[PDB]
Amino acid sequence: SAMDDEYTKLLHDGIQPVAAIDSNFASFTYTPRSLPEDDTSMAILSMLQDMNFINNYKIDCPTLARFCLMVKKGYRDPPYHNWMHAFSVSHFCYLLYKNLELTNYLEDIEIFALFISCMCHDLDHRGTNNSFQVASKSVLAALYSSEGSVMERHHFAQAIAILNTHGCNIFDHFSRKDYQRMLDLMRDIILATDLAHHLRIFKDLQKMAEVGYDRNNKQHHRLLLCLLMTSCDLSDQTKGWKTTRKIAELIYKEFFSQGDLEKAMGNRPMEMMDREKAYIPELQISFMEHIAMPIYKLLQDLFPKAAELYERVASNREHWTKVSHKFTIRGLPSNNSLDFLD
Template sequence: MSQCPFFNSRVPLQVERLLSSANNWQFDVFKLADATQDHALSTLAFFLFHQADLIRKFDIKPHLLARFIRRVEDGYRPNPYHSKIHAADVLQSLHVIIHRGGLSPGYVDPLTLMACYLAAVVHDYEHGGVTNDYLINSSDLLALRYNDRAPLENHHLAAAFTLLKKPEYAFMSHLPKADTDRLRKMVIELVLATDMKQHFAILSHFTTVHRLGAANSVTPSHIVIPLDENERILSLQMALKCSDLGHVSASLPVHCRWVQLLEEEFFRQGDMEKLHSLPVSPLFDRCKPGITKSQVGFFDIVVIPLLNCFSRVFSNTKPLLTYTMRNYKYWADLQKMEQAVGNGNTSGK
């Protein structure tokens, strides 16, 4: 790895050790951010391109790839949650799901792998730290530009592909048009699927395609070939969605850190909503309980059904569900304890 052209000098030992653990189900991206002077995303992305031999296979000029990744990294704003560290975390999670979860090689040829990595890298590029609903309610220019339809996700994609048109970042400009068209289509499909408004529709579609609601219908683990092209893209969308929520399966301290960061980002939006006389979004008012008090419901409604469905089709991803249930138990026990304390206070009145 010391010969990797992305680095000007020998890779620090700590960074090398952290990158060597990038195949693990649980990964502390904050440690990589510290070790790389806040360049976890660019360091990890270039490493994964290099490790997968994508640079050689597609005859990519390393300096153009490195320059593009660094530019995207710099375009992530210093939000508490939707930051370049989050993008690195999603990238690492997607990498593991693909390579250890059973999607490779059946669902992922080299061009698709590059599309998946690229989608993870850019999926929150230039995120403003507010939700789509806020952009729509405040008549933000992005909402006007994209007609209130997934303004954030559309912007992440448009801004990233605009960069790729510039000669100094165009690391794929030499590829055949058929390849770049196919890659672009995949990246668009994947990133648009991260809009949580699409969550239940995508999950329902995946459940229907794989007949997961039928009795005793669980896809055998040895089946790793897509049913068709639509199902292949759908499964990759599910993989990125699982990765976007990847912190739910992290070690408890890392997971709790992410939840606290998201809560602070939500509170900051709530502050802005108050400032501009907009209705304050549920759980966004810092004077009231935030998402740290609603994790059990979030796991019950969103997280566990998603990971359960995905792991029934791709059984090698079951470690994600196992680690997630450990964190769920923490929130459930905490909720019970707080309820018991509340009941005790009430009975004492």
Template sequence: CGARNFWCMLKQNKLSTYLKRGAISYDSSDQTALYIRMLGDVRVRSQVGFEPERRSSHPYLFIDFRTLHSKYESHSVPERRLHRLLSCQRYLHSSRLLRGVPQQIPLHILDEDYTGQARCMLEKVGNWNFDIFLFDRLTNGNSLITLTFHLLNHYGLVELFQLDLVKLWRFLVMVQEDYHSGNPYHNAVHAADVTQAMHCYLQEPMLAKSLTSYDILLGLLAAATHDLDHPGVNQPFLIKTDHYLATLYRNTSVLENHHWKSAVGLLRETGLFSHLPPEDSLNVERDLGSLILATDISRQNEYLTRFRTHLDQNNLCLINASHRHFILQMALKCADICNPCRPWELSKQWSEKVTEEFFQQGDIEKKHKLEVSPLCDRETNTVGDIQIGFMAYVAEPLFAEWTRFSDTRLSQTMLGHMGLNKASWSSLQQEQTSIPAAPSHLMITFCLFLLLLPPLLINH
């Protein structure tokens, strides 16, 4: 009853903002086609030979994204994870959890891999130095499922929104499966890391005292799905190879639109919100899309300028639903690129992984005789150069404004780590060459990079 009243109140307060915020309209006449396309992106196309409505003759279009980095793949994983899902469902069906869960009993979905060490780590999931790589090993590669389920339960969202446990677990398993484990960077561990960072931001005083349960639900779901089915190549690559996704989304926020629509497809396929009125379900999908689309790095200046204006005018009012949603967008943007703000041991690993993904794209471009994208040539770029430039011209401006908004111990810690990490990369650069990297050279390189057309920006 409480959840129902909450949704009714939510509809009254936010209906007007929904109509303005939706970037893509949902015409009832094309619901079926839209849904088939979403599922076709991942399943239908691979299982029954789904063909996009337009193909070019470029040979890359006949390469499955999931084979790009095949040397990293473990082909035994899908079968093992399917077995884990079925075991969990049998457990749920045979337990009293499905007949109603008393409030005082915690919702722990355990299996043989959910060890005491992982449980101990979850007790400190709000710490900024949380080691997601260790947690992923302790959960046998299921960090995204375990972490997201724990946080949804931690905030009381499973009970408040009356989420069916089998549907929720199935949804999380499918989300994790739709991340490409062969991607060095854009994989389920990255999604788990972003979700953990989002949790840290949700605990900040400015947000904790203002956000509603609906806001928190959206923030966690958006973090978990924000890079869903990422192909391991960026938007410029999809555009110049005339990929059908670039055509479908008209070369605009191609990957972000695909992540959003893939997430919506899984929500509908599992029926996670099917118990809600259709209008409420649609609002969840639209707001989820608004958050995911905000992670488009080519719109960085747009969001940063709006954020600065709000802070300069001191007119952010978190009682206002649209302002809360905007802060959620900024929080997700920070969580998405927070790697330079982590402790060096973690930040360095992420830096190496994202750079390797860039370089692998460059290798593919060379193989197919395409122009190599900026920062993707392993012969002319280094991890240090890329990271120093990224911190100076992308991360630092964003986190400086976030600190103006929420000047807390966490914000100062993030800025401190970023400064130390930047200095560490500079030291490594100087050790590797007798001529120290000139700041002016880095500035010219990154300024030119950021001033190119939006499609030429890296989808980080």
């Protein structure tokens, strides 16, 4: 019923102009997690409208309103992999569209697929990684462990289940060819969010950046879509320091909850998921150096206007070294007590 009245307003009230959301809404400096969650479904419609997808693809407005709410409701509330993550990843896709001239690189339908994939790419995340699905012998591992990318296959399957819900198939007027294309793109893009997949294709991404993007090379299109999806997925690290500090809190809260579960199963968690071993500043520096910075360096190599993104990621990484000394207890704790020693 609450879904129903939210739908009624989303459908009949009109799509707010994107500029009314925030006067910096289309800037790389904007932090979409500042938007109240109650306003995010309308902001999705505003972005879809501003990218001209609603008109270009003649999306049915009741269907689209239903779809957007179904996707939002398809996220649970772990500390990090929740709807506000999917919303902020989608918003970064919109930023890429508005700032980087993606139409010189990608087909319209590929840009559309990228944005819809961003909305859907973590659907029904339970706050645990692929390794945990296998180790805990979850239903998801029973379905997909033999293919790999367990969670990402689930996210994709959830996206399809939403489309296959009556009243929610925003593509169902597409030609059979275009429908097959959209769903194939969604598969490839959502599966690209597995960082194991990123790490596997990284050399090919480097080689594409080295030789130069060839808009007539179908494999270049696929590679670029993967890179852009990863860039959206990690885009929290391209904001200022307070965003990255908070996002670190959320990720490690989620990780440490998984680690507590693995210990209860008699298994040794990864150091980064073990609240007794993980040293957050060094793990964040390592993640920035070895994963985040190279991704945004490739993005800048391909799109010079993305330079500020890489510079911000590098700065945030420098901040971690600067604050690391504060994880060492000087003097006495604030209570003047050493009772934590016992």
